Paper text:
High-resolution crystal structures and biophysical analyses of a truncated form of the TbMORN1 protein and its homologues from the parasites Toxoplasma gondii (TgMORN1) and [name] (PfMORN1) enabled, for the first time, a structure-based definition of the [name] repeat. All three structures are antiparallel dimers joined via their C-termini, and, when possessed of the correct key residues, can adopt extended or V-shaped quaternary structures. The crystal structures confirmed that each 23-amino acid [name] repeat is composed of a β-hairpin followed by a 6-residue loop that connects to the next [name] repeat. The structural studies presented here make a case that one conserved function of [name] repeats is in homotypic interactions and possibly also in higher-order assembly.
Diffracting crystals of selenomethionine-labelled PfMORN1(7–15) were obtained and its crystal structure was determined to 2.14 Å resolution using the single-wavelength anomalous dispersion (SAD) method. TbMORN1(7–15) P21, C2 and TgMORN1(7–15) crystallised with one dimer in the asymmetric unit, while PfMORN1(7–15) crystallised with one subunit in the asymmetric unit and the functional dimer was formed via crystallographic symmetry axis. Interestingly, PfMORN1(7–15) displays a V-shaped dimer with an inter-subunit angle of about 45°, and incorporates a structural Zn2+ ion at the dimer interface. Unlike the extended dimers of TbMORN1(7–15) and TgMORN1(7–15), the V-shaped PfMORN1(7–15) is mainly stabilised by a single Zn2+ ion incorporated into the core of its dimer interface, spanning over 665 Å2. The Cys306 and Asp309 residues from each subunit tetrahedrally coordinate the Zn2+ at expected distances (2.32 Å for Zn2+-S and 1.94 Å for Zn2+-O). In addition, residues from repeats 13–15 are involved in stabilising the dimer via a combination of hydrophobic, polar, and electrostatic interactions across the subunits. Although Asp residues 303 (TbMORN1), 308 (TgMORN1), and 309 (PfMORN1) are conserved in all the three proteins, the coordination of a Zn2+ ion clearly demands the presence of both cysteine and aspartate residues. Such pairs are present in PfMORN1 and TgMORN1, but not in TbMORN1, where the cysteine residue at the corresponding position is replaced by Leu301. The SAXS analysis of PfMORN1(7–15) indicated an extended structure in solution however, similar to that seen for TbMORN1(7–15) and TgMORN1(7–15) and different from the V-shaped form observed in the crystal lattice. This supports the prediction that TgMORN1 and PfMORN1 are capable of adopting two different conformations.
Numbering used by the authors:
A (entry chain A), B (entry chain A): 148 to 349
Write the structure that this text describes.
């Protein structure tokens, strides 16, 4: 109970030791000047488990977090929070491999869904925002702009089942605005969509 | 241990009682002439649990089977095996609602996948065989003939993303043979496919 069993260089916790915390946490790893630095394992009382780098009593560098619910993070940390390039395996099978800033997907990364769908592009605030490509499980592909996990802006949808390529505007994950359908017989249709429904042909 | 605690009409297990079996099973329900008939609950030693009808020491009629792995069957039984109209909830979320013959899907039924896809049609030997409709999660729809869970024969595929309707031959779940693509601009393409790939246009 808030004890320490390790080396005591110059009367300060330095080297390698074990520390049990008042809230129930336990740390076993390297120490400098009473700080948690180097490498070590922290066992949370809630069942979470961390193994990786430490700087100034905080996760800094590469480390892994084994969560209770089954998730696992493998990546870099800054000031005790997910930060930088890291991989996160979700409970059901989904996996994100990309950049993080302050414990949220921000930057370029890819999500491998357990359904077979694969996204890779730019993330802003834990959601798809900006340019990205979604490779659907059926072979369909969307490449274009995203806003808050919705196909939003202009993108190109190519259908694997019949080869038809849509090129035009999207709003809230649906075809909306000016666009063109190009079929495999060379013919190109121009039209106006409203919430994914073609309503006007030119 | 192979005891009996129930009514004993005319020196035979009749009425309602409890029977513990030598392999570990336990039955609690109605009895006629030493037989398990009427209704009752059988607790298997492996953790399986049955509640429903019984005729002549066997599941006959409607009853439910709570499996260990998480599955659950709700339907009719004949001679201790799944038989007739019944519903089966799979571990991950999938559910079959249809006909069974000898513990296997045989007849007309529908499977509600946890992915959102819904099939409904004829089943032969636990697989799709014959006419059936597959309503995909993306809005796509296939209606045609199936062989061993594969689109096989002639069917009609309609694509929700661009409206293109394919009508032609399928072999081993892929477009193969004579077929026609009908686009939303009225134009109809005739061609020959090879394993889902259009290779010849007429
Ligand atoms: Zn299509």
């Amino acid at each position: 109970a808030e004890t320490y069993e390790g080396d005591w260089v110059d009367g300060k916790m330095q080297g390698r030791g074990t520390y049990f915390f008042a809230d129930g946490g336990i740390y076993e790893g390297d120490w400098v000047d009473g700080k948690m630095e180097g490498k070590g394992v922290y066992k949370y009382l809630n069942g979470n488990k961390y193994e990786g780098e430490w700087i100034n009593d905080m996760k800094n560098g590469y480390g892994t977090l084994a969560y209770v619910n089954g998730e696992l993070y493998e990546g870099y940390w800054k000031n005790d929070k997910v930060h930088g390039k890291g991989t996160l395996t979700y409970s059901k099978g989904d996996k994100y491999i990309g950049e993080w800033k302050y414990a949220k997907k921000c930057g370029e990364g890819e999500l491998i869904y357990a359904s077979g769908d694969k996204f890779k592009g730019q993330w802003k605030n834990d959601k798809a925002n900006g340019y990205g490509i979604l490779l659907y499980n059926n072979g369909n592909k969307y490449e274009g702009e995203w806003l808050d996990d919705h196909r939003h802006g202009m993108g190109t949808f190519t259908c694997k089942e019949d080869g038809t390529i849509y090129s035009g505007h999207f709003q809230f994950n649906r075809k909306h605005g000016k666009g063109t359908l190009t079929f495999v017989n060379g013919h190109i249709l121009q039209g106006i969509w409203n919430s994914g429904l073609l309503e006007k042909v030119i």
